[PDB]
Design a binder for this molecule. Structure first.
Ligand SMILES: *[C@@H]1O[C@H](CO)[C@@H](O)[C@H](O)[C@H]1NC(C)=O
Lengths: 213, 220, 12
């Protein structure tokens, strides 16, 4: 089967900039190449067919070129809504095969997270488990540290983080840090603190509550 | 409009078979072929096969032994079936239609069906409020959310106020707990002055367990 | 990078 090699693996550009994606084939495939965009939680969307031919409903800023083995998908002025992965597909040789994709990240100005902390609901406490949630909302860039402390003891290994993909409108990330304790352990302690470190903060920001008030 | 709607996501036991139904509209199965493509961590996008207008089928070489595609033209349905699944068959499965009847440029896609191959059991989530307070209200903006905890398998869909509320919503990617069950949170920021007048409900749906929960989230 | 089933996005 034809091997399609996409490079580079990740692209990172600022809005308004031109950007190009490379798709290389293991043997010549004329112009039998199609390109797709995949957004967060989406199905692939067909961008270009046969190397350079346009698709109805696709913005004009998308184009493609190339023939033989070397192919290029281009976006002449990147917008935040372009945050996605991009795939090539060849169909000169059965069976049709896809490349492994290139990721497109957008740069933007530094944005400090807004930090919120949520104690466990009394509902959850009835099940014998306590989740304490810390939210870091709408920040850039992606690197952040969350430090948990219970009664000034460093918490380690009992929390999990999830991070959103880049927002398609404002290019920020959001992060959730969830600290999980048995109801028994939770009731044996008073001060629950989430400490947040980020490039956009001059000092770490701490949000906390006392179990009760 | 041209559309392809797939059957819901779910669990299949290892060495068992997978069945997906693709239902189309805006065109006739007698005029177009329907293709099947999957997407997995290990192998990315793979074309699996196709059923053509007149009923002929082609299967990608490593799948001929365990893949069957059938359809009912009148009912506009295409039926995908794959035998003896193993773990690495865990993937998103899609049906798709080309631009022209004979071609492979996929302009129309189904919404995808997440198939988890696992010996485990389906388990619905519990939904817990992430209540707004003063420790979640700064500069007139309040954060609130829902903790969707202890379900299997993926996916779970979350929406706010029956779809009416989307602005400022963040639904976090699920994370696998040590229990082997998933957990996630979905949050939203709103004007804190609206907490007294507006109701906030996260609508949670875990199709693999047919678990639908609407959780009202109030300031505590 | 690897495709992520949770987000349908490439994870690196
Ligand atoms: C699944 O495993 C088989 C070997 O058991 C391998 O040939 C195949 O490529 C794998 N498929 C994946 C990783 O999607």
């Amino acid at each position: 089967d034809i091997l399609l090699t996409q490079s580079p693996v990740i692209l990172s550009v600022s809005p308004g900039e031109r950007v190009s994606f490379s798709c290389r084939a293991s043997q010549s495939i004329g112009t039998n190449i199609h390109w797709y965009q995949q957004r967060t939680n989406g199905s692939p969307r067909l961008l270009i067919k046969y190397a350079s031919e346009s698709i109805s409903g696709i913005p004009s800023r998308f184009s493609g070129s190339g023939s033989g083995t070397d192919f290029t998908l281009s976006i002449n002025s990147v917008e935040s809504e372009d945050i996605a992965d991009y795939y090539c597909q060849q169909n000169n040789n059965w069976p049709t095969t896809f490349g492994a994709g290139t990721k497109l990240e957008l740069k933007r100005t530094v944005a400090a997270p807004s930090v919120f902390i949520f104690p466990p609901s009394d509902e959850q406490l009835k099940s014998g488990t306590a989740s304490v949630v810390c939210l870091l909302n709408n920040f850039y860039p992606r690197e952040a540290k969350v430090q948990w402390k219970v009664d000034n003891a460093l918490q380690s290994g009992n929390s999990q983080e999830s991070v959103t993909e880049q927002d398609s409108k404002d290019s920020t990330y959001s992060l959730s840090s969830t600290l999980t304790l048995s109801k028994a352990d939770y009731e044996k302690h008073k001060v629950y603190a989430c400490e947040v470190t980020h490039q956009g903060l001059s000092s770490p920001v701490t949000k906390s509550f006392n179990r009760g008030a | 409009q041209v559309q392809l709607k797939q059957s819901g996501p779910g669990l299949v036991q290892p060495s068992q078979s997978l069945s997906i139904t693709c239902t189309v509209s805006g065109f006739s199965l007698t005029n177009y072929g329907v293709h099947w493509v999957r997407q997995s961590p290990g192998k990315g996008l793979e074309w699996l096969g196709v059923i053509w207008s007149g009923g002929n089928t082609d299967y990608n070489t490593p799948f001929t032994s365990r893949l069957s595609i059938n359809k009912d033209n009148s009912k506009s349905q295409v039926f995908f079936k794959m035998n003896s699944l193993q773990s690495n068959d865990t993937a998103i499965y899609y049906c798709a239609r080309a631009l022209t009847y004979y071609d492979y440029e996929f302009a129309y896609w189904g919404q995808g069906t997440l198939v988890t191959v696992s010996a485990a059991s389906t388990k619905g989530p519990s939904v817990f409020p992430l209540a707004p307070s003063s420790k979640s209200t700064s500069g007139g903006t309040a954060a609130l959310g829902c903790l969707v905890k202890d379900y299997f398998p993926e996916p779970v869909t979350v929406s706010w106020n029956s779809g009416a509320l989307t602005s400022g919503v963040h639904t976090f990617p699920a994370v696998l707990q040590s229990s082997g069950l998933y957990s996630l949170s979905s949050v939203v920021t709103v004007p804190s002055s609206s907490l007294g007048t507006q109701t906030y409900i996260c609508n949670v749906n875990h199709k693999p367990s047919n678990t639908k929960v609407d959780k009202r989230v109030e300031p505590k | 990078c690897q495709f992520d089933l949770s987000t349908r996005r490439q994870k690196c």
